[PDB]
Structure 1
Amino acid sequence: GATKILMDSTHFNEIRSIIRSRSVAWDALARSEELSEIDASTAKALESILVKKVNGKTLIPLIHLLSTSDNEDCKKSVQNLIAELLSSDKYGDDTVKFFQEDPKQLEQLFDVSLKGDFQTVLISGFNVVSLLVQNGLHNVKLVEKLLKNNNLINILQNIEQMDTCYVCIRLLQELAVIPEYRDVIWLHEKKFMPTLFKILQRATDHLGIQLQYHSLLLIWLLTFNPVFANELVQKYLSDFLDLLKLVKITIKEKVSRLCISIILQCCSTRVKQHKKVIKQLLLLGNALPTVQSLSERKYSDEELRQDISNLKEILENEYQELTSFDEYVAELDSKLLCWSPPHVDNGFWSDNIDEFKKDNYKIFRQLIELLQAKVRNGDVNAKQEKIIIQVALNDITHVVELLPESIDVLDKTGGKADIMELLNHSDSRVKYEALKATQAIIGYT
C-alpha cells in the first residue's frame, strides 16, 4: 500500500515462494489446542482469504502466537503471512495502519524477530525492516535492536549463503534508505565494511552482481552524508583503491558508476581536506591511467559519463600540481619567468611531459609564442628579458629533446630561425643556451 520495496530482486521472490510453500494447518492447531483457537481460526480463514475484509482484528490475535510460540513452524508461518500481508496488494496500507496506530505493537514483534535458525531470522526481519522505515513509523529502537542482533550478524556475514547475505544486505540498504536512520548504521558500519570488502575482492577475479551493486549502493548512500563519507576513505585506503579497476572491468555500468560516484564523493570538495584522498589514490593507486582510460571509455547512462568526466577533471585538477605544472603556466601567462628548477629537474619535466602537447601542440605553441614575441618585436637583451628568454630556450630545448615530433612545429613557427638567430647574442649564457638548443635541433636530423 505505502512504500513496499524489495520486490525487484528475484531472490526475495524465490524466498517468499519457498517460505510460503510450507504446509501448516491452523485448524489442526485449533483442534489440538496448540494455540489460541480464535487466533488459529482467524489464521486459517486468512490463509484461504489470501491464497484464494479488513485488518486489525487478527492483528492482536496473531500477536498471541507471536509473543508466545510453542512451535517454530507456527511462528515461521505467522511472520511469513505477516510480511506477505504487508506487501499484499489487497491489504497494503491498511496493514501498515495497524503498525502505524500503535508503535509499541510492532516493538515486541521486533523483539521476537531474528532468533534461532537462519530460516526464522529472515521473514520476521523482513517485515520488521519493512515497518521500521515504512511511512510515518520511525524508531531508533528498531535500528539499535537490529544492529546488535547476533542472529542476523551471521546472516549478513555469511559468505557461504549468497541468498541470506543478499537478503540481509538489501535489508541493510533498505533500512538505511533514511540517512537520518543511517547514523547508527554508520556507527556499526565496521561490521558491514568487511562483507563489502569481501564483495569487492570477489568482484576482483547470473544475478550475482546485484548483491555487490546493492552493497556499493549502500556505500554511496552512506557517502551522501559528508560526515560518514569523511571517515569513509579516512578508514580503509586498501579497499578504496580497488574501486575503479574492478568497476571499469565490470561489465554492467551499475557498479561502475557506483564506484565512480562513491569515489568521487570520497575525493569531493564537500569532504573536508579530501585533497589527500585523491592525491594518494592517484599516487599509490595509479588513478591517472585509470581516469584516462575511463574517460576514453564509453557509458550508457548520462550520469555515469558526466560524473566520469567530472571526476577525471577533478583528479587532473590537483594531480597536475605536485610538482606544479600550473606554476610555470602562471609565469607563461604573466610572460615573466624566474629561477626555479622546473625545466632543470627531470622529474618535473616528466610530470608535465604529458601536458606539453594537447591540441596542435597548444602548450608548445604557448611556449614558443613568448620567445617569438620577444624576438620579432621588443628583443632588447638586458637583465630580465635575457635570463627569461634563455630559460625559455633551455626549457624549449628539454621539450624538443623529450618530444621528437615537436620539431615539425619549430620550423613552421619561425622558431628554427629565431633559435638560429639566437646563436649570436650579447650574453655568453644566452648564447650558450641558444647554442645548446641549436645542437638540440641538430641532435636529430
Structure 2
Amino acid sequence: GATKILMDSTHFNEIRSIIRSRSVAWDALARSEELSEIDASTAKALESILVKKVNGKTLIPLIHLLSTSDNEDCKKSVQNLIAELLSSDKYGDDTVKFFQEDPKQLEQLFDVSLKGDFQTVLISGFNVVSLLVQNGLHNVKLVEKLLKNNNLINILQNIEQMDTCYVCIRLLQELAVIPEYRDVIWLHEKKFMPTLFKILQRATDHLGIQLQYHSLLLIWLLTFNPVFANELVQKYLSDFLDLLKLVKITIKEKVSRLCISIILQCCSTRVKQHKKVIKQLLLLGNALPTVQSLSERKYSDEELRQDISNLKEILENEYQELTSFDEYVAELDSKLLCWSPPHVDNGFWSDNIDEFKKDNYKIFRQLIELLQAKVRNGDVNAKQEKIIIQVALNDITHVVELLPESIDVLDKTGGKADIMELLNHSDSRVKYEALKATQAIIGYTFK
C-alpha cells in the first residue's frame, strides 16, 4: 500500500483498545454547544464508518475540533479516529494523500498533536509519525520538533511503563528508517540513548524482548554512519562493550544479531580508527573469549553465525598485532592501573620507554596526570584509588630511572613533589612506591 507502521504491535493494539473503549457522545456535546456539529457530526459519522468515505473533507473538521476544543476526552477519540484511519486498511491510503497534497495540514495536525493524557500523546505521536515518515511528507523540522518535545520524550524515558516506553521507541526507530531523519535524531541522542541502555542492563540480567530489540534496532540504524558509530562508541563506551554481555546471555537470536552487528558496524572498515574499537573490545571488553564462545553454537539463523564468525576474525587478527604496551595504554587510558607482568617487566619498560617520551612525553604527562588526580580527586584510599597510585608511582619510577630527563616534566607537572608527601601515608606500598619513587629522583636531582 503506502505504509502502515506498527501493524503487529499487540501492546499498541492493546493501548488502542483502551482508548476506543471510552465513548463520546458527540451529538450531546454538539447539542450542549460544547462542539460544532459540523465537526461533531462529522466525527460521529466517521466513528461508525470505522467501528460501525474517501478521505478528503473529513479531516479538516476533525483537526478543527482537534484544535478548537477543550474536551480532552474528545480530541482523544479524534486523535484516535485519526489513527484508526491511517491503519484502516480501506482508508489510511487516501488519509495520507490528504496530507501528501496539503503537507501543511500535517504541519497543522502536528500542532494539535502530542498533548495531554499520556495516550492522547501517543496516538497523536503515532499518527503524526505515521505521516512524517511518509512517501513524500518528510519534514524534519517537525521531527526536529517532536525530537525536542517533552511529553513524548518523557514517555519514552520512563522505562517503568514498558507498553508506552516501548511504543515511543518503536515510533522514534520508524523515523530512523528515514535516512534523512537519521541526522536530526542522532543530533539528540542525549535523550533516547541513555534510556536505550538502561533498557539494556535490565536486559543484560516477549514485551521486554521486543523493547530490547527495538531499541537495538533504533541504534543499529543510526550507527550505520561511521561517524555516528564513531561517536557512540567513544561516548557510550561502557554500555557499548556491554552489548556483548547481552549478546551472550541472550536468546531469541534477533537481538544478538543486532548486537553483533552494531558491534561490527562499529569496527567497520569505515568507522575511523576502528582499530581502537577492536582494541577496546578485545582489551577493555573481552570481546574475544566472549565471541569465541558464541562463534560456535546454535544459530539456526545462518547470517547470525556468519556475523559472529566474522567478528571472530576481526578480533583475532587485531589481537595478534597486540603488543604489551597496548595493554599499558588500555589501563592508562581507561584510568585503571593494575599489576600485571609488563608493569614489573624491565623488558616491557626496556622497549616501550621511548613511547613514554613522545610528544613531550604526552603519555608520561598522562601517566602523571592520572596520579595527580587520584590524590585530590575523590581523595580515597579505597584499595582501588589507593592502587592506581603505586602502580603509578611504579611506572613513573621506571620512566624516571630510564629517562632521567623526565625529572623536569615531573618538576613542572608537580608530581615530583606530590610524591614527596605521598610518603606520609597510611598504606605501606603507597608511601613506599612513592618512596621508592622518590629515592630514585633523589639521585638525578643533582650534578
Q: Which has the larger radius of gyration?
A: 1
The runs of 5 or more residues in structure 2 that have no matched partner are none
Give 1:245 deviation, angstroms.
2.0
Of 402-411 and 279-288, the range deviating more from structure 2: 402-411
When residues 188 and 9 of structure 1 are mapped into structure 2, their CA distance, relative to the original with a 3 A threshold, is same
CA distance in structure 2 between the aligned counterparts of 1:354 and 1:27, rounded to whole angstroms: 86
CA distance in structure 1 between the aligned counterparts of 2:17 and 2:346, rounded to whole angstroms: 67
CA distance in structure 1 between the aligned counterparts of 2:284 and 2:118, rounded to whole angstroms: 42
Give 1:160 deviation, angstroms.
1.6
Would you say the 8 A contact 1:279–1:318 is kept in 2? yes
Would you say the 8 A contact 1:292–1:312 is kept in 2? yes
CA distance in structure 1 between the aligned counterparts of 2:385 and 2:60, rounded to whole angstroms: 92
| Percentage of pairs with the same residue | 100
Would you say the 8 A contact 2:3–2:134 is kept in 1? yes
CA distance in structure 1 between the aligned counterparts of 2:20 and 2:382, rounded to whole angstroms: 93
Would you say the 8 A contact 1:267–1:275 is kept in 2? yes
Give 1:329 deviation, angstroms.
25
Of 178-187 and 412-421, the range deviating more from structure 2: 412-421
Would you say the 8 A contact 1:200–1:212 is kept in 2? yes
Instruction: Please give the per-residue CA displacement for 1:407-439, whole angstroms capped at 9, x wherever unaligned.
Output: 999999999999999999999999999999999
Would you say the 8 A contact 1:323–1:351 is kept in 2? no
When residues 435 and 182 of structure 1 are mapped into structure 2, their CA distance, relative to the original with a 3 A threshold, is closer
Query: Taking structure 2 as the reference length, what is the TM-score of the superposition?
Result: 0.72
When residues 245 and 44 of structure 1 are mapped into structure 2, their CA distance, relative to the original with a 3 A threshold, is same
Report matched runs for 1:112-123 at 5 Å: 112-123=112-123
Of 96-105 and 377-386, the range deviating more from structure 2: 377-386
Give 1:398 deviation, angstroms.
28
CA distance in structure 1 between the aligned counterparts of 2:329 and 2:350, rounded to whole angstroms: 16
Instruction: Please give the per-residue CA displacement for 1:204-232, whole angstroms capped at 9, x wherever unaligned.
Output: 22432101100001110111122211212
Would you say the 8 A contact 2:244–2:259 is kept in 1? yes
Would you say the 8 A contact 2:55–2:95 is kept in 1? yes
Query: Taking structure 1 as the reference length, what is the TM-score of the superposition?
Result: 0.73
The runs of 5 or more residues in structure 1 that have no matched partner are none
CA distance in structure 2 between the aligned counterparts of 1:426 and 1:152, rounded to whole angstroms: 53
CA distance in structure 2 between the aligned counterparts of 1:43 and 1:427, rounded to whole angstroms: 78
Would you say the 8 A contact 2:162–2:207 is kept in 1? no
CA distance in structure 1 between the aligned counterparts of 2:427 and 2:38, rounded to whole angstroms: 110
When residues 309 and 325 of structure 1 are mapped into structure 2, their CA distance, relative to the original with a 3 A threshold, is farther
When residues 169 and 389 of structure 1 are mapped into structure 2, their CA distance, relative to the original with a 3 A threshold, is closer
When residues 387 and 8 of structure 1 are mapped into structure 2, their CA distance, relative to the original with a 3 A threshold, is closer
Would you say the 8 A contact 2:65–2:75 is kept in 1? yes
CA distance in structure 2 between the aligned counterparts of 1:161 and 1:89, rounded to whole angstroms: 29
Give 1:287 deviation, angstroms.
1.4
**Aligned partner of residue 124 in structure 1, secondary structure:** helix
Give 1:241 deviation, angstroms.
1.0
When residues 59 and 328 of structure 1 are mapped into structure 2, their CA distance, relative to the original with a 3 A threshold, is closer
Aligned CA RMSD, in angstroms, stands at 15.7
Q: Post-superposition, which runs of at least 4 consecutive aligned residues in structure 1 deviate over 6 A?
A: 324-445
CA distance in structure 1 between the aligned counterparts of 2:50 and 2:74, rounded to whole angstroms: 17
Give 1:48 deviation, angstroms.
1.3
Would you say the 8 A contact 2:261–2:307 is kept in 1? yes
Give 1:7 deviation, angstroms.
1.1
Would you say the 8 A contact 1:320–1:326 is kept in 2? no
When residues 103 and 365 of structure 1 are mapped into structure 2, their CA distance, relative to the original with a 3 A threshold, is closer
Of 369-378 and 384-393, the range deviating more from structure 2: 369-378
Would you say the 8 A contact 2:27–2:40 is kept in 1? yes
Give 1:363 deviation, angstroms.
36
Give 1:46 deviation, angstroms.
1.3
Give 1:92 deviation, angstroms.
2.2
**Aligned partner of residue 229 in structure 1, secondary structure:** helix
Q: How many residue pairs were aligned?
A: 445
CA distance in structure 2 between the aligned counterparts of 1:426 and 1:154, rounded to whole angstroms: 48
Would you say the 8 A contact 1:80–1:124 is kept in 2? yes
Would you say the 8 A contact 2:82–2:127 is kept in 1? yes
Would you say the 8 A contact 1:56–1:98 is kept in 2? yes
